[model samples]
Target chain A: MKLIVAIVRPEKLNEVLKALFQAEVRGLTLSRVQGHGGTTVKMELHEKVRLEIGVSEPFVKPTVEAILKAARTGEVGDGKIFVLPVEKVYRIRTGEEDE
Target chain B: MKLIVAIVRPEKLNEVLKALFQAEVRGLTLSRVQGHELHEKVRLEIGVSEPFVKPTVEAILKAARTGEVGDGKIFVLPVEKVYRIRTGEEDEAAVT
Candidate 1:
């Protein structure tokens, strides 16, 4: 499995969520975050939203594409996507993997 | 070391924190999150030593359980790197 973590504009979350849901990528996690770009004059805090999606390898491409399609706004800080390999996932209640 | 990211019900935060505290896992980051399960949730990001992973996970499981659909999930992922800004520390020591 792979974990898809995206840092996107806060205002874009609703669109992103809807897009992902429509793509059948329903399971995800979202949080508020502050992102800093490479160059900083003093301390610039870019308010953002972090979205985490856990999916099997097969769904990775479509899942990422869905997020990108929704999150892009032709802006510099549209945010970034990180793909991480997941060793395991457990659904707390049933103690099952990736339910 | 591993990064254990758990998405749990919002109301269960206190219990989860207490459970982890008792296990001697002191460092973790918490944030209010809306889980894809369609409910308010808490997202906990914990840095755990390899040997402590099981106990740490057990702590979360014990506290986050309610036998329901939105109980959320726990994910174990590799920690490629860790850095501590205050003291200019990096890697294993940084996380600890």
Candidate 2:
């Protein structure tokens, strides 16, 4: 499994989620975060938002592709995406790993 | 090693961070996202904001139970193994 994390503006998030779901991806996890690069631009304190979602390996590429399709606003500060390798996955409710 | 990802409401984020930081978690990567389940036909749009956050720690259990919307959801993933490109140590020895 891979953890696909993306950081973007607040406005572009809805379509990103919808597009991913439409692609037939099953489940994902997410969270909200606020931070900035060291650029010292004196911008809004919370100019950036963090989006964390996970997909099984088979779905990684398409999931990311979906985000690219949905998140594009053709604007500055659109945000960046990171794909991390997940060593293992466990279901909290069952405490069982996905086979 | 493990990665703990949590989805939280915008309001409770501060408490979540403080609790985790207090537990001595090291570096974490964070992102923002939006999503909704289908069965409900719930079209929680971008109107419903999303945030992606990760916490790296050996002490996550206590910090996680505090409970708040900012503490929307938490998942613990088993890490088969990890590599640190810099120091070349494996697992928890990794600086991140």
Candidate 3:
């Protein structure tokens, strides 16, 4: 499965999360990260939150695009988005393939 | 090398971690996040606060049972195998 990780504005989180669930996306993993854009615009030092979501390959692009649309408040410090490849999967509890 | 990622019930985290630890599953990255079902909304805690341990191949595959969509997802990839251009490991002096 593809690993789709996104960093979005904190305020847009609720709407984004709500959207993904409705899209029939399997699952996602998120993290709060501190980052800045390619062109520095006076970034907040550990002020912005980074949302990292890991979704299946089928939902990767769609997920990122959806968030990008909603997360665009048409303002600065909105955050960034990223997508990557996942090689394997495993469950911490059950000793079986994480279908 | 394989990279396994899982998303289980928040309540089930402790049990899962304890099990993994006992199973000799080394190294993991976690993050607290906001998640939900179709009906309700709740605070998602994104985390990799757990110990990041590197386990053996056998242990890796064995830790994938609870594989439901909301349960969690993992990814394994092919590595031409990049080397540690600069590593901090002081021992095992063998050149990697």
Candidate 4:
């Protein structure tokens, strides 16, 4: 499994979700942010949505493609996606893995 | 590019943010999510490296606490294979 973290222009968010749905990606958590590089308080005040989606190995290609396909072509850098490998997953309630 | 999200109680935020800065944990994204009738939690999103991961989460874990259920929670997610946007830069060399 992998975690796909995306910084998307807020306006392009629904489209991204639509694309993600088409790719059959699920378990997404998201939020809005406005920022830059200093102390985390100084972005250009441009609101963007952060998409945190986790998917299995088979979906990585289509997931990235769906994001690129839907989130591209905007003046605001079209956001960015950082895909990370999920080392392990634990179910807090049961303290288990991949059960 | 590991991403850490902290759902901290509003009262403990400034302390945790200050702690994060002390650890050189840069790039923070914060937002507010409505909670239960008795909850007022502030959500924080941080992007950092592996070593920084320990410092970032622990720093918050120490400060954003009341030794109670509503204290806060820290989530650490992996990241790498990331690069530049408008240019050809990527990876460790792309640090600010």
Candidate 5:
């Protein structure tokens, strides 16, 4: 399993979520975040949307591709994606554990 | 090391924070989040080494549980790297 954290422009939220829905990935956690490039000494709040998606191994690639397809704007601050290895997941609704 | 992401009800934030504090988990990142099954949830992100993972999650579960519909979910993931932006510390040191 893998956890994908995609940081993208706030304006791209709708499109990205739509793409993920089309990809058949229903569950996601969305957060508004600020990104910093560290080029200037002062840290400025660059508004962005951080989408967190948890996918089992098979769905990781397709889900990530979907996010990239929808969020890429060819701009300097298009944002980045971080993929982390997931050890386990617990769904409170179903009381089921996935390893 | 592991990264634990706990998605809990917004009202449980204070209690969860207190539990984590009692567990000696001082550093954490909190964000306003919405899950597929719940609304206005709080996502707590904690980075800790392998040994701390269980205890950390236990702390979160203890405070976040309510035996209700939106009690929340917990995800444990591996951490490849971590950095403390203000101090320029990296990896284990950054997390500690």
Candidate 6:
């Protein structure tokens, strides 16, 4: 399994959400974050939205494409998507991997 | 050596926090999240050493379970390295 952590400008969240929705990616967690700017006269902070989506192998490519499609703006700080390996997942409500 | 990302229902946050505290896993980041209107989520990010991985995970699993559908999930990701933003101190104590 893989956990794709995507960080994008706050304004781009709705677009990314729609993009992920189009890809049929439903399960995800969204949070607000302050990201470091690429270059700064005195170090600036940019508001960002961090989306954490845990998915199986086959979904990785499309999942990434979805985020990139909607989150990218050709700008220096458009944001970044991190693909990390998920060792294991446990469903708190039950033994089966779910909700 | 591992970054444990656990998502649980908002109501279970305190229990899980106490569980981690008892287990001596001090470092963690918490945030509120929205998954579905549908469901609400609280994300907990904890970076622990190799030795504390199992116990830390166990603590969350046990404390967060409430026999309901939206109880949430936990994901363990390998951490390459961790550093403190202030001191730039790498590994060990910073991650402990």
Number of the top-ranking candidate, with TM-score as the measure = 1
TM-score of chain B, candidates 1 onward in order: 0.88, 0.57, 0.44, 0.80, 0.88, 0.91
Ranking by DockQ: 1, 6, 5, 3, 2, 4
lDDT of each: 0.86, 0.53, 0.51, 0.68, 0.81, 0.84
**Residue pairs with clashing backbones, model 5:** none
Could you tell me the lDDT of residue B22 within candidate 3? Answer: 70
DockQ of all models, two decimals each: 0.77, 0.15, 0.34, 0.10, 0.52, 0.68
Q: Which structure is stronger by DockQ: 1 or 6?
A: 1
> Which tens-of-lDDT digit does each residue in B32-69 have in candidate 1?
88876457888899988788888988888989999978
Predictions ranked by TM-score, top down? 1, 6, 5, 3, 2, 4
Root-mean-square deviation of every model: 4.1, 10.2, 7.1, 9.6, 4.9, 4.1
Q: Higher TM-score: candidate 2 or 3?
A: 3
Sliding window of 10 residues with minimal summed lDDT for model 1 chain A = A35-44
Model 3 residue A56 lDDT score: 57
lDDT of 5 by residue, B1-96 (tens): 678888988988999899888877758988788876337898888887777887877777777887877777889877778787878888677765
lDDT of 6 by residue, A6-97 (tens): 99999899998889888988668887888774875654787898888998888899999999999888987899999988887776677555
- The top-ranked prediction according to lDDT is 1
Q: TM-scores for all candidates?
A: 0.85, 0.52, 0.57, 0.50, 0.77, 0.81
**Tens digit of lDDT per residue, candidate 2, span B13-35?**
55556665664544555544443
* lDDT value for model 2: 0.53
Report the lDDT tens digits of candidate 4 across residue range A1-99.
676788898778889888988777754656676646336443457787887665667888898999999999856457789988665433222233331
Task: Name model 6 segments beyond 4 Å from true.
Answer: A38-43, A97-99, B82-96
- Model 2 chain A is weakest, by summed lDDT over 10 consecutive residues, at A90-99
> What is candidate 5's lDDT per residue for A1-99, written digit by digit as tens?
788999989999889888998899966888778988647544467889888888888889888999999999997788988988778887644445762
Give me the displacement of residue A60 in model 6, in angstroms: 0.1
Q: What alpha-carbon RMSD in Å does predicted model 4 have with respect to the real structure?
A: 9.6
Worst 10 residues of 4 chain B by lDDT: B32-41
